[PDB]
């Protein structure tokens, strides 16, 4: 992984040593080069993972997340450079450095071979994230609750597992895993191993930090939060469930119920959301509830669907935040009903809205549909009755996805808004860089299906 870690580090000297007006040109050009080289990780074998060294490895699960992570950095730079134009040079460079350090932690987090190394990097990602959202945001209980009920119990459980098993290396755990027998102490080990990831997904009932975070965050913060940071919870659960069997058989039930019901609740809430960024944030809770279900029932089909859903959602949700940001940069408001009939004024940007909406409601054969379908098939075997809940969710999702399109793009334009300038080349390029790779992945879906393929 050093071929990716070191060049990512070199983005920092590049940004700080660049000419005053070239900081966006240099960082974007060179982060795209790093993203290009990330395709070399697709050297995946049918039996073995790609094991670089004693610290880092890459299987079919972390590879697509790594490529998504490295693709996002250049996109985040384009999305940010307009609203940071008036910031001074040193604060521009500090913002870019925060994005680079977040990529550095992320690529190591997805490739850490030892779970305690994963945990340390998994928590370091919050330092640049909180700085980004606070220092460049628009305007306590959850930090305290999350650490109390998530981060700290996970640390104790991992340390306890290492004492008992003798290792936390993931390859070693694949061969030395022992069954988890029923006991009250094992019930707390199970919860301690999962609650930190459930909060970050987020699990329904623990999700209200996400709409709040998205409302305050700048565009880059929302992009990485929606595309990659949520998937740390999914990735962590996909790994740590290896050592939680067979206790997951019954411990999953309350969390499956929360997700299956949470799907319909958060989808329904999207119909009544008055703020675009909140609507997308609740849409992410609904989509991620499918990933939680898929991880918990742990079947070969549910894991392939979960991997595709995480990748597909990352591109789609990030694209939707960029679309909502392009409106905000004109009308300076997040309210969905304020600016209507925008298709009359911005015809091409309306096409992006349509394509983003179509992937959001999982139109076949988008990878949004493939991932969603695989989970629906797997949960039907788990219990035939689940098809009703999954089916209803598909209906409501199409309703709010098209409601968002109809409210903002269709109808009559708002008379008094007269600063709707034509879409810049920067914005159109930003949208096509989300949707083109997303639609191209339909041609070769196998590379985002994960290691169970």
């Amino acid at each position: 992984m050093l071929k990716y870690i070191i060049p990512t580090i070199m983005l920092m000297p590049l940004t700080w040593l660049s000419k005053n007006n070239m900081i966006w040109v240099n960082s974007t050009a060179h982060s795209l080069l790093i993203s290009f080289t990330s395709l070399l990780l697709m050297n995946q074998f049918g039996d073995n993972s790609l094991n670089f060294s004693l610290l880092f490895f890459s299987d079919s699960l972390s590879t697509p997340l790594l490529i998504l992570t490295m693709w996002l950095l250049p996109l985040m730079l384009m999305a940010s450079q307009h609203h940071l134009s008036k910031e001074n040079l040193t604060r521009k460079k500090l913002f870019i450095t925060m994005l680079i350090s977040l990529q550095l932690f992320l690529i190591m987090t997805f490739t850490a071979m030892e779970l305690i190394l994963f945990y340390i990097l998994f928590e370091a990602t919050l330092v640049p994230t909180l700085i980004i959202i606070t220092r460049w945001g628009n305007q306590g209980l959850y930090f305290l609750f999350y650490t109390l009920a998530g981060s700290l119990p996970l640390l104790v459980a991992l340390i306890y597992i290492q004492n008992t098993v003798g290792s936390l290396n993931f390859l070693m755990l694949q061969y030395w895993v022992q069954p988890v027998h029923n006991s009250w102490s094992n019930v707390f080990m199970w919860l301690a191993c999962m609650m930190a990831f459930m909060v970050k997904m987020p699990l329904y009932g623990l999700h209200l930090w996400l709409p709040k975070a998205h409302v305050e965050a700048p565009i880059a913060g929302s992009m990485v939060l929606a595309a990659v940071l949520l998937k740390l919870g999914g990735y962590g659960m996909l790994r740590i469930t290896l050592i939680l069997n067979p206790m997951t058989d019954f411990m999953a039930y309350p969390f499956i119920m929360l997700s299956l019901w949470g799907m319909i609740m958060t989808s329904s809430i999207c119909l009544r959301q008055t703020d675009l960024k909140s609507l997308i944030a609740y849409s992410s809770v609904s989509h991620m509830a499918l990933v939680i279900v898929a991880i918990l029932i742990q079947t070969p089909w549910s894991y392939m669907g979960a991997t595709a859903l995480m990748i597909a959602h990352g591109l789609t949700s990030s694209m939707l935040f960029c679309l909502a940001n392009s409106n905000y940069e004109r009308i300076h408001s997040r309210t969905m009903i304020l600016a209507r009939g925008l298709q009359t004024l911005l015809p091409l940007m309306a096409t992006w809205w349509l394509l983003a909406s179509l992937t959001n409601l999982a139109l076949p054969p988008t990878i949004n549909l493939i991932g969603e379908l695989f989970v629906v098939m797997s949960t039907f075997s788990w219990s035939n009755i689940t098809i009703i809940l999954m089916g209803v969710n598909m209906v409501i999702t199409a309703l709010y996805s098209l409601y968002m399109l109809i409210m903002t793009q269709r109808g009559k334009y708002t008379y008094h808004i007269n600063n709707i300038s034509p879409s810049f080349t920067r914005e159109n390029a930003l949208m096509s860089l989300h949707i083109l790779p997303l639609l191209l992945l339909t041609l070769n879906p196998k590379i985002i299906l994960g290691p169970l393929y």
């Binding site: 049918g46 039996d47 070693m172 061969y175 742990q298 079947t299 070969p300 549910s302 169970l452």
Partner: protein, 170 residues
Amino acid sequence: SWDKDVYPEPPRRTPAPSPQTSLPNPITYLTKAFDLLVDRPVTLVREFIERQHAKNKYYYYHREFRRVPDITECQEKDVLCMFEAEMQWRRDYKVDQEIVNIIQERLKACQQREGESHRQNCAKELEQFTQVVKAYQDRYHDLGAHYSARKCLAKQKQRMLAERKAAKEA
């Protein structure tokens, strides 16, 4: 082009035309136009391409994996032996998936080929599909996403003990 034993096809029997009309058959005149306009130029282009491939002939091979000891022969917690047994089991698991795929394609081709008489004429293909699916189910079903050679072996022993217990009951 492909092994006719792995993907068999019964001998073809097309009946000779027996026209009982005097109107010309338009499909015979469209066949000659197709051969003249579509097939022949396509064949010529391919023959040119194949001549170039003949000039430069090079080979690729089918990888052969030697057999290594099964997980049953591995000592507990011996990762080095477990690693090779586990990797071999995964290769065999993937091959068995393609064996079921081959038998499913035989069955599907038979259904289309036999037409309205498929229920009677595809009995052999259905029987072979039924048996292989059973064997595949016994090996691999219900293992879970975190499947392994260990979990497959544990499933086998559970089934073997039940069979041994049922043999005594009889």
